[PDB]
Design a protein around this nucleic acid. Structure first.
Ligand SMILES: [Mg+2]
Ligand SMILES: [Mg+2]
Ligand SMILES: [Mg+2]
Ligand SMILES: [Mg+2]
Ligand SMILES: [Mg+2]
Ligand SMILES: [Mg+2]
Ligand SMILES: [Mg+2]
Ligand SMILES: [Mg+2]
Ligand SMILES: [Mg+2]
Ligand SMILES: [Mg+2]
Ligand SMILES: [Zn+2]
Ligand SMILES: [Zn+2]
Lengths: 213, 98, 147, 91, 136, 101
RNA sequence: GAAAUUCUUGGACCGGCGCAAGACGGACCAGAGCGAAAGCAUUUGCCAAGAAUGUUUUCAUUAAUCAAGAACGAAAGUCGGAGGUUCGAAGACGAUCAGAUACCGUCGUAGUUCCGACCAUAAACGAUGCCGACUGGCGAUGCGGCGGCGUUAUUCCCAUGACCCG
């Protein structure tokens, strides 16, 4: 017989400080009424935020995910949790009469998160090509996923979590594999399709705050 | 890279000098002749940590094979079992470099 | 084989007096003779070790659980059975587990359990086609066989 | 010079005990008296002194194993799932 | 029912979930987490005939009520997650979609981003029905 | 008598393929026997994109699409009137049907 | 088609976070490849085998087809062991029908999966035995090989990759 929506407070959620826009939106929590804590039932919340509403002029077919970790009061602070690829894009990129290449590898950064990274690469039809197939071999595939496993670890073993984001806001890896695999067989549609965090470290409090200035 | 272990020991049994056993290769470590010592993964725990002290005193590499000493018997071609292989003279093999 | 499950002699270094306490256990599957069995709460996780219920992860096959945080072993200790740890709960300090009957039960996450199934499995086969070979079975423990 | 043509070991019973009770048992009569290879030495293992209590005789090293074999069916997929949870916390 | 914001400065976002079967149609408006909900109404609550549980007019009679229950609480913009039945079963969103999206966009909201969240399996199990299949 | 040269399918040099279920029915058809349509489709047809593009926030937000790969059996593929039987002399023309309407 | 048996204020259905378990590997996948036939699609590794082409190497008819006698042989089915998600013969039930012990709908054992012993049957179909040549063309597609204008990257270019014409 009572409306329970006046028993709530709206909070805000922020981003780390290598992006542009800080605000994401508002998320209501119950008051701390007796035992249950409004910081507690809000802290474990995940925000699916597309990158073109986090930047000014970048692509829109990439998404990030941001959990919450700490309560400041009308302020949640967020950390990187993973990256997704839109079903618009991936299904608008897989088409017949071309060859699909996938890969996946695990890596631990210098402070430790156990990132799992996936990838994909499609072969490109040439300019004057009249042969319809444009298939690859199998030894040229295995000599391609050897390079993608060499590169994701090589770009990741020697830095922290703050700088691989700056190596994922552009397409700097897909550019690199496209130009270090153009020698064997010319591929055009290269992405890292999912980055997943496995095992987060100890909750040190102000490495985040360093990520908020 | 098991093929770079088994195919070399194929050549060593024809080419150069080998000594198999324990009492015979502790005489042959003590007398300053051995150059490479192989152990299988069921030499119990101890003589594993004793051969690594004679070879501590002679500066000789000790390699650990993957399987047991039945596989190591077959890999040496013979029909019995063997725990401790010691290679003195390779001859025409390149086992010492890997 | 008074009853049909194998035991184990485990000898501990007792840190109070100068003496060696002996014990007994129920042998899990694949125990050597000469095998350093550790025992405690900071104990690493392999077979023979015995460590509390609250720390092991989910879906781990255990045996000889204590229904109460200490009573020196009362569950799932027969020839070839195993309980499974289902979940946890950080507040109220409890932990669910499924028994070999099929039922489920809530146990406080402070008791102890060895890791691994009970050695001696597959006993219910080999039908006793003889009669007095069940007779030498129940000449042991007790007297109720000729129903 | 074979002389039994199917009954094998269980030919010691005879006309007794039925038929598929002398066929369900041939395997679980053969596979307890056999001499396995050890894990530390060679080929002297048939002395199951009792149920679940397999025993050597050159290495002199008793193993508390299965009740009719050396290994069971379940406890090998168990030892693999225990080594999996053991390296799944550390990596 | 409270609001801390200013109108034209920003747009307060929520998010909906447009479930669209061949016989029933959900609309479930939640928040950015999805964990916290706002309102939920089905097609089946409004029409007393189970053969048109999912008529297109039966989504309009509930979508107008959702945007009517939400304007009292202060939401201007929405994200959209569209969702079929999914799985090994069919994957075509039914007819209760393209007249319920227009039905609330016409009813005065600020439509944001549009995507698909249909649960496509990598490798299906076996669909219910025989090798000769449901014949009739 | 024998009516088609290949027996309605593409099994020329294998001896065996794997089965694939339909969508409307569940009839099991091997893959190279099936009739595979490929349906791309917008989420609005013609007249609601005017009323999306007006009530949107962004500047001419491009709408997405809905990429679905279908299958059909025979008697669904004919009872739903995708294919029609043809005369014997106009069976052989295997060019796809035209793309005007 | 239209409904009901069925679940549900001890909170079902939907939304989010997690977690177990056992199967199946789409979209990429084509009148393409391999294998004696049945048959074979997640990554990575090890063990040996085999076609075609290249060959101014080798031995010098050692070959062809095959009564008796042998190896393999999808599914289903049987006796054992583990493992039991989903489907699901038999079965019960709700409608439909003059009647349905049937198609339709909810639940569901035996089975479907794994290792070990068996059974040897299919529209096992290209409904066309195996070796041998011989007698018209026209475009294609796939491995190995032989040349060639030219673009493309490596840049520092013979040579290796990608197209193109034989
Ligand atoms: Mg006829
Ligand atoms: Mg066939
Ligand atoms: Mg796949
Ligand atoms: Mg014959
Ligand atoms: Mg069976
Ligand atoms: Mg069933
Ligand atoms: Mg009937
Ligand atoms: Mg079967
Ligand atoms: Mg069989
Ligand atoms: Mg023949
Ligand atoms: Zn033995
Ligand atoms: Zn059909």
């Amino acid at each position: 017989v009572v409306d329970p929506f006046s028993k709530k407070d709206w909070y805000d959620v922020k981003a780390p400080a290598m992006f542009n826009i800080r605000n994401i939106g508002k998320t209501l929590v119950t008051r701390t009424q007796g035992t249950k804590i409004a910081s507690d039932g809000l802290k474990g919340r995940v925000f699916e935020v597309s990158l073109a509403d986090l930047q000014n002029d970048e692509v829109a077919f990439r998404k990030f995910k941001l959990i919450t970790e700490d309560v400041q009061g009308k302020n949640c602070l967020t950390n990187f949790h993973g990256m997704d690829l839109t079903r618009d894009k991936m299904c608008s990129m897989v088409k017949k009469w071309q060859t699909m290449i996938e890969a996946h590898v695990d890596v631990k950064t210098t402070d430790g998160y156990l990132l799992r990274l996936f990838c994909v690469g499609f072969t490109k039809k040439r300019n004057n090509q009249i042969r319809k197939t444009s298939y690859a071999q199998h030894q040229q595939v295995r000599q391609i996923r050897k390079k993608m496993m060499e590169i994701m670890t090589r770009e990741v073993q020697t830095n922290d979590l703050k700088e691989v984001v700056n190596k994922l806001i552009p397409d700097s890896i897909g550019k690199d594999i496209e130009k270090a695999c153009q020698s064997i067989y010319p591929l055009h549609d290269v992405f890292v399709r999912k980055v997943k965090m496995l095992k987060k470290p100890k909750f040190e409090l102000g490495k985040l705050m360093e990520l908020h200035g | 890279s098991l093929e770079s272990i088994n195919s070399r020991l194929q050549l060593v049994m024809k080419s150069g000098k080998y000594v198999l056993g324990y009492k015979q290769s502790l005489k042959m470590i003590r007398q300053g002749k051995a150059k490479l010592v192989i152990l299988a993964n069921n030499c119990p725990a101890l003589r594993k940590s004793e051969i690594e002290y004679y070879a501590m005193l002679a500066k000789t590499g000790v390699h650990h094979y993957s399987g047991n000493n039945i596989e190591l018997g077959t890999a040496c071609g013979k029909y019995y079992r063997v725990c401790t292989l010691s290679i003195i003279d390779p001859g025409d093999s390149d086992i010492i470099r890997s | 084989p008074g009853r049909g499950a194998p035991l184990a002699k485990v000898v501990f270094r007792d840190p109070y007096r100068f003496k060696k306490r002996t014990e007994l256990f129920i042998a899990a599957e694949g125990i050597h003779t000469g095998q350093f069995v550790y025992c405690g709460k900071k104990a690493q996780l392999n077979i023979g070790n015995v460590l509390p219920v609250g720390t092991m992860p989910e879906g781990t096959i255990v045996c000889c659980l204590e229904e109460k945080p200490g009573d020196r072993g009362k569950l799932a200790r027969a020839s070839g059975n195993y309980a499974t740890v289902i979940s946890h709960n950080p507040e109220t300090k409890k932990t669910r587990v499924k028994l070999p009957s099929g039922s489920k039960k809530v146990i406080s996450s402070a008791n102890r359990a060895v890791v691994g199934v009970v050695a001696g499995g597959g006993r219910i086969d080999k039908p006793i086609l003889k009669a007095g070979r069940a007779y030498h079975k129940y000449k042991a423990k007790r007297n109720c066989w000729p129903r | 010079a074979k002389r039994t043509k199917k009954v094998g070991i269980v030919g010691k019973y005879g006309t007794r005990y039925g038929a598929s009770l002398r066929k369900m048992v041939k395997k679980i009569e053969i596979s307890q008296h056999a001499k396995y290879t050890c894990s530390f030495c060679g080929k002297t293992k048939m002395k199951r002194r009792a149920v679940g209590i397999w025993h050597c005789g050159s290495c002199m090293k008793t193993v508390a194993g299965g009740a009719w074999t050396y290994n069971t069916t379940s406890a090998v997929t168990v030892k693999s799932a225990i080594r999996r949870l053991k390296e799944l916390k550390d990596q | 029912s409270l609001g801390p914001q200013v109108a034209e400065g920003e747009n307060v976002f929520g998010v909906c979930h447009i479930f669209a079967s061949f016989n029933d149609t959900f609309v479930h408006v939640t928040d950015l987490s999805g964990k916290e909900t706002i309102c939920r109404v089905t097609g089946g609550m409004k029409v007393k005939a189970d053969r048109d549980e999912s008529s297109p007019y039966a989504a309009m009679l509930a979508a107008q009520d959702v945007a009517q229950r939400c304007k009292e609480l202060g939401i201007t913009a929405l994200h959209i997650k569209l969702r079929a039945t999914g799985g090994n079963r069919t994957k075509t969103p039914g007819p209760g979609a393209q007249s319920a999206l227009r039905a609330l966009a016409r009813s005065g909201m600020k439509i944001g981003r549009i995507e698909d969240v249909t649960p496509i399996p990598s490798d299906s199990t076996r669909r219910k029905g025989g090798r000769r299949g449901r014949r009739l | 008598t024998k009516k088609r040269r290949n027996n309605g399918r593409a099994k020329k040099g294998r001896g065996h393929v794997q089965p694939i279920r339909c969508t409307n029915c569940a009839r099991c058809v091997p893959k190279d026997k099936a009739i595979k349509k490929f349906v791309i489709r917008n989420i609005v047809e013609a007249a609601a994109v005017r009323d999306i593009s007006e009530a949107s926030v962004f500047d001419a937000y491009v709408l997405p699409k809905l990429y679905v790969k279908l299958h059909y059996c025979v008697s669904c593929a004919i009872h739903s009137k995708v294919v029609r039987n043809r005369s014997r002399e106009a069976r052989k023309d295997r060019t796809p049907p035209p793309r005007f309407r």
